[PDB]
Scaffold this active site. Structure first.
Site, short mmCIF file in Angstrom:
data_model
loop_
_atom_site.label_atom_id
_atom_site.label_comp_id
_atom_site.label_asym_id
_atom_site.label_seq_id
_atom_site.Cartn_x
_atom_site.Cartn_y
_atom_site.Cartn_z
N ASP B 45 -33.80 64.17 18.23
CA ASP B 45 -32.88 64.68 17.76
C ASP B 45 -32.10 64.10 16.67
O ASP B 45 -32.06 64.59 15.63
CB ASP B 45 -31.85 65.40 18.73
CG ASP B 45 -32.37 66.70 19.37
OD1 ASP B 45 -33.50 67.41 18.91
OD2 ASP B 45 -31.64 66.90 20.77
N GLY B 46 -32.04 62.77 16.60
CA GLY B 46 -31.42 62.08 15.48
C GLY B 46 -32.33 61.93 14.29
O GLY B 46 -31.82 62.10 13.34
N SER B 153 -26.26 75.88 18.11
CA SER B 153 -27.06 74.68 18.50
C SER B 153 -26.33 73.55 19.08
O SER B 153 -26.85 72.96 19.94
CB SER B 153 -28.22 74.76 17.54
OG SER B 153 -28.11 74.34 16.50
N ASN B 159 -19.75 68.89 21.96
CA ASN B 159 -19.35 69.88 22.50
C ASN B 159 -19.30 70.08 24.10
O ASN B 159 -18.50 70.44 24.67
CB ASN B 159 -19.73 71.33 21.95
CG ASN B 159 -19.36 72.71 22.31
OD1 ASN B 159 -18.35 73.26 22.08
ND2 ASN B 159 -19.98 73.12 23.57
N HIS B 218 -24.32 62.95 12.34
CA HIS B 218 -24.30 61.51 12.47
C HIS B 218 -23.48 60.68 11.60
O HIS B 218 -23.02 59.47 11.96
CB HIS B 218 -25.77 61.12 12.40
CG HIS B 218 -26.53 61.84 11.23
ND1 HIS B 218 -27.45 61.11 10.35
CD2 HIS B 218 -26.57 63.22 10.73
CE1 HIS B 218 -27.98 62.26 9.59
NE2 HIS B 218 -27.37 63.31 9.66
C1 LIG Z 1 -28.81 62.83 18.41
C2 LIG Z 1 -28.16 62.25 17.74
C3 LIG Z 1 -27.60 61.56 16.79
N1 LIG Z 1 -26.18 61.40 17.27
C4 LIG Z 1 -25.54 62.49 16.83
C5 LIG Z 1 -24.92 63.24 17.81
O1 LIG Z 1 -24.32 62.63 18.99
C6 LIG Z 1 -23.61 63.81 19.77
N2 LIG Z 1 -22.80 62.96 20.40
C7 LIG Z 1 -21.82 62.01 20.02
N3 LIG Z 1 -21.03 61.77 20.95
C8 LIG Z 1 -21.27 62.34 22.14
C9 LIG Z 1 -20.71 62.28 23.22
N4 LIG Z 1 -19.85 61.66 23.51
N5 LIG Z 1 -21.32 63.13 24.30
C10 LIG Z 1 -22.29 63.95 23.97
N6 LIG Z 1 -22.89 63.99 22.78
C11 LIG Z 1 -22.43 63.04 21.87
C12 LIG Z 1 -23.01 64.47 18.68
O2 LIG Z 1 -23.37 65.79 18.89
C13 LIG Z 1 -23.71 64.10 17.30
O3 LIG Z 1 -24.13 65.30 16.82
C1 LIG Z 2 -24.47 58.88 18.89
C2 LIG Z 2 -25.35 59.07 19.77
C3 LIG Z 2 -26.66 59.59 20.56
N1 LIG Z 2 -26.10 60.79 21.57
C4 LIG Z 2 -27.05 61.87 21.15
C5 LIG Z 2 -27.59 62.53 22.69
O1 LIG Z 2 -27.50 63.62 22.43
C6 LIG Z 2 -28.32 64.54 22.01
N2 LIG Z 2 -28.42 65.43 20.91
C7 LIG Z 2 -28.35 65.53 19.83
N3 LIG Z 2 -28.21 66.94 19.39
C8 LIG Z 2 -28.41 67.63 20.49
C9 LIG Z 2 -28.26 68.89 20.75
N4 LIG Z 2 -27.92 69.62 19.77
N5 LIG Z 2 -28.27 69.45 22.14
C10 LIG Z 2 -28.28 68.67 23.09
N6 LIG Z 2 -28.35 67.31 22.64
C11 LIG Z 2 -28.28 66.71 21.45
C12 LIG Z 2 -29.53 63.50 21.60
O2 LIG Z 2 -30.69 63.80 21.92
C13 LIG Z 2 -29.02 62.43 22.71
O3 LIG Z 2 -29.52 62.60 24.00
#
Ligand SMILES: C#CCNC[C@H]1O[C@@H](n2cnc3c(N)ncnc32)[C@H](O)[C@@H]1O
Ligand SMILES: C#CCNC[C@H]1O[C@@H](n2cnc3c(N)ncnc32)[C@H](O)[C@@H]1O
Ligand SMILES: C#CCNC[C@H]1O[C@@H](n2cnc3c(N)ncnc32)[C@H](O)[C@@H]1O
Ligand SMILES: C#CCNC[C@H]1O[C@@H](n2cnc3c(N)ncnc32)[C@H](O)[C@@H]1O
Ligand SMILES: C#CCNC[C@H]1O[C@@H](n2cnc3c(N)ncnc32)[C@H](O)[C@@H]1O
Ligand SMILES: C#CCNC[C@H]1O[C@@H](n2cnc3c(N)ncnc32)[C@H](O)[C@@H]1O
Ligand SMILES: C#CCNC[C@H]1O[C@@H](n2cnc3c(N)ncnc32)[C@H](O)[C@@H]1O
Ligand SMILES: C#CCNC[C@H]1O[C@@H](n2cnc3c(N)ncnc32)[C@H](O)[C@@H]1O
Lengths: 258, 258, 258, 258
Positions: B45-46, B153, B159, B218
């Protein structure tokens, strides 16, 4: 215009009701509690809930208004001192519509309900276990105290106490929240509240026990030999008579913040 | 059709990318990373997030597809073994659109961002205090770690960790969740997540400190001398190329339940 | 008795401090901010926190008292109008002891801290991932924003905002709460706050990034090349001078309920 | 040594029970289900709960051991394949004690219960409202679904589902958690779980309705004309026979993490 007024039944509410009827007597307005076009509820949200359920078969022909004689309500959002002003304005308004929840209960050997706040399901003496099915897809096996399906306007009620999100009633949706779910290495639920759009169907299906205590707003009934409980956003809507702006979020602020 | 492929940059992803390009070479397809009509992201997803932000100025002209070389993603929802099948089908599909979040940052003496997951606000070394204003109405004074505004999404991401609700991406909305809010006799927040429809504007206004660490997906930037942060559902949407049914709720089940 | 008074530094607090010093001048009391036996803090809990940390090397020889010039505090629990009464009574009291938290930080190529409220750990620009080890047993791999370890008296502070339990300070314990943990099919944390007795050791060990932002009460420092963060209930205790009954639970009621 | 064995009553458990009895027959051990000194429970935690309540009047004379024929239990923490080893070792061990909860129910015109997991209070058809009184001090008026008071070992059960903290059973305490509390401008609860030390008394007092559904572990009874419900840490403790190290936190890890 045909109209009726329900009262909480305390002194304050009955006297307010008699005064509004007297004032309506000065206009072209007919009291009719069989086919009203306007339903005024004087009391609290509980009183308003009963008004809605009393006339839930003529929702498309009725505009509702609530007066709060106790504390401010989400449905009963006008003050008693404004009754006279309400009489006048009603005599000669815009209409605002909120989404409703349809609950279907199927058995062995079918009943439907309409909710303004929410419908909940719990067990009738024993462990609650149901399979949660979304649009025919098995989503999770839920073990806990029960589940709650809220309308948007209901989100400020039971749904809020369960950690649910508050959603603006302009969004046609329903929200499912968990009651004390068990989560361990063995048992697994989503945890989070789930918000469903119109046309999505959430089905609860018994795993073992088939008896359930089901609530729709204020009414709570023990259902026997249940095969399925279906939730979906209703095609029907409740209509409010709108006389001035009182934004939902301001209503939320006034009720919860200060 | 013009297309490009981004890779996570590990061995597995680069080789998969070279193979798909080779396979695309057998069809009427032009590699073009300047004006692609199709953007394939291979990774997680990143990786998909970066692809979106790389081309966020041509969203209306692009259909996105994600391949997951690691674990299943919400955006990167196809498997590597299906790459060949994807090449064929793409060569000769329906399009699915998800809502996006617009963040506006205003200063003293204006910058806008688009988010696919969420935008968050925290302080830059100190106590976080902001006034939350909904459609010009003062809703609450928030004291805590920060706030998060999610797309539908995005609700499965940050969230979700904050107790937010999961909402089907067909709902045009944004959701505000709190990070560690202080609530006592003196300080008061709503607590609950809040779900906002299109056209509603949520404004965060500084009380004392005017420096904030603001994130959009990100990217995380320290903003100075901030006067306002405005959130609203964007008019723009991200478009996915859809080749088979993979319902959001099934995606949720697969990612969180089993 | 040797004593000193710290002030928040606003007008109200400095004048109150001068008046108490003048009143102490009528008794056998020596102002000494090097080796006081009594430390009076005038201000809020922040002011009291600084007083504690100023003298954290002589905790066994000091009895603390807090006066609240702003709102009621958990540590600064006496009112300004009672200053004169406090002067008298102090001149000629029982002592009440609360547990403290010991934080040890180890590096490559060791620093210890004492907390009255809590110690927290977050990443210094990047994803936070640590292995949580309880008494040498690997308990979980934590992914999220960070973690918080609270003393009993700290449980009403940051710990409370994170969903932690409030615990009576007579219980010699520490409590670990999560900040925005990620939980999916892949990643797994306990979710619940964890309460640890004396003699239990909780160790946080880096997985990838070894840089962490570590806080102890008000102080927040970026630590580099961290190998371990150890938490345990301290052998040291803070001592309060007690002049009248003001039960913890009443303090909680007054601060949070009404 | 006098001993008895209770079984879940399924095939696996009864055969295991017969085999252990046969094996005990090779030693100086007398089966006696009236005055056993050792009580072996074979099944799950539910089976162990019944064993405890069967002999709750001789807790000081009994050491309990649980064998799990289904999934791993917190009380039934030994595997069936280890039955033979358990027979031997028991024949010729250290004892480990956990705290218990005392519930007192007073009426009009008094009954006490002992809980190993928790005691809960809900209404018997209607709104639940009680005044919560801590050591004779009025703490809050609770409106919601109900309340739950957990022992330390109970904290992994119902308490956990309600957002409660997990606490090491070496801590002599009880923990109060809320079920769906109503919080608005009008109604106010602490929200957070509350952890109470020994000797603290929590009293629930009816406001209007005096009928309550009260549970103690597995047993749930409708109580009529209730005047008070008192909770306190019991003077009695449950004693386990300990044959090897199996730390509580490892038990927690094994049950919830992996
Ligand atoms: C995937 C990916 C790249 N990282 C970005 C995403 O990390 C997610 N994230 C950052 N911190 C948390 C977190 N603490 N718990 C769950 N998701 C998180 C957030 O949605 C952000 O969009
Ligand atoms: C910073 C950072 C990494 N945290 C991101 C984690 O949340 C995940 N993530 C990114 N976008 C979403 C998303 N939109 N829904 C659920 N998980 C997501 C990503 O795959 C990874 O598991
Ligand atoms: C059973 C019972 C009484 N609980 C109802 C409480 O919730 C209130 N209520 C009913 N409907 C709503 C509602 N829709 N939003 C917020 N509060 C609501 C009602 O005013 C009262 O405060
Ligand atoms: C008002 C009114 C009449 N009571 C019915 C409403 O009570 C509300 N309610 C019942 N239990 C709770 C509850 N435990 N917390 C908040 N609201 C609750 C629920 O929304 C239901 O619609
Ligand atoms: C940074 C910052 C300021 N946040 C501190 C808030 O929490 C309060 N605080 C500090 N210590 C405690 C505490 N121990 N219990 C409850 N509140 C506390 C302080 O009074 C203030 O209300
Ligand atoms: C008082 C005071 C000085 N600030 C320090 C305290 O602020 C408290 N704090 C910091 N952030 C939060 C927070 N987000 N919610 C509640 N309390 C918080 C924390 O307990 C810390 O000890
Ligand atoms: C009613 C009912 C069944 N729910 C009980 C579930 O909780 C489990 N349980 C019983 N006691 C505890 C306990 N003390 N800790 C964790 N789980 C427990 C039991 O094993 C089962 O998983
Ligand atoms: C095991 C077993 C027998 N059931 C009794 C136990 O079930 C547990 N329980 C009942 N409801 C729930 C629940 N909803 N979530 C978690 N545990 C629950 C509770 O601890 C009680 O002691």
């Amino acid at each position: 215009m045909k109209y009726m007024i329900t009262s909480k039944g305390d002194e304050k509410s009955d006297l307010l009701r008699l005064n509004m009827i007297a004032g309506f007597g000065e206009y072209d307005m007919e009291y009719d509690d069989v086919e009203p076009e306007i339903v005024i509820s004087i009391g609290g949200d509980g009183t308003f809930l009963s008004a809605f359920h009393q006339y839930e078969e003529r929702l498309d022909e009725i505009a509702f208004i609530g007066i709060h004689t106790g504390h401010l309500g989400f449905y009963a959002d006008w003050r008693p001192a404004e009754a006279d002003k309400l009489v006048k304005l009603l005599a000669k308004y815009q209409k605002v519509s909120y989404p409703l929840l349809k609950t279907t209960v199927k058995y062995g050997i079918e009943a439907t309900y309409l909710a303004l706040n929410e419908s909940t399901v719990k067990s009738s003496g024993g462990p609650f276990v149901v399979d949660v099915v979304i649009n025919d897809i098995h989503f999770e096996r839920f073990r806990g105290d029960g589940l709650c399906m809220s309308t948007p306007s209901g989100t400020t009620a039971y749904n809020k106490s369960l950690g649910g999100a508050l959603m603006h009633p302009s969004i046609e949706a329903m929200q499912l929240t968990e009651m004390a779910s068990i989560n361990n290495r063995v048992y697994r639920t989503i945890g989070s509240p789930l918000v469903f759009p119109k046309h999505h169907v959430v089905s609860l299906q018994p795993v073992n026990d088939k008896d359930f205590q089901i609530s729709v707003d204020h009414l709570s009934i023990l259902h026997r030999d249940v095969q399925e409980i279906r939730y979906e956003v209703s095609a029907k809507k409740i209509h409010f008579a709108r006389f001035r702006s009182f934004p939902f979020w301001r209503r939320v602020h006034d009720s919860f913040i200060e």
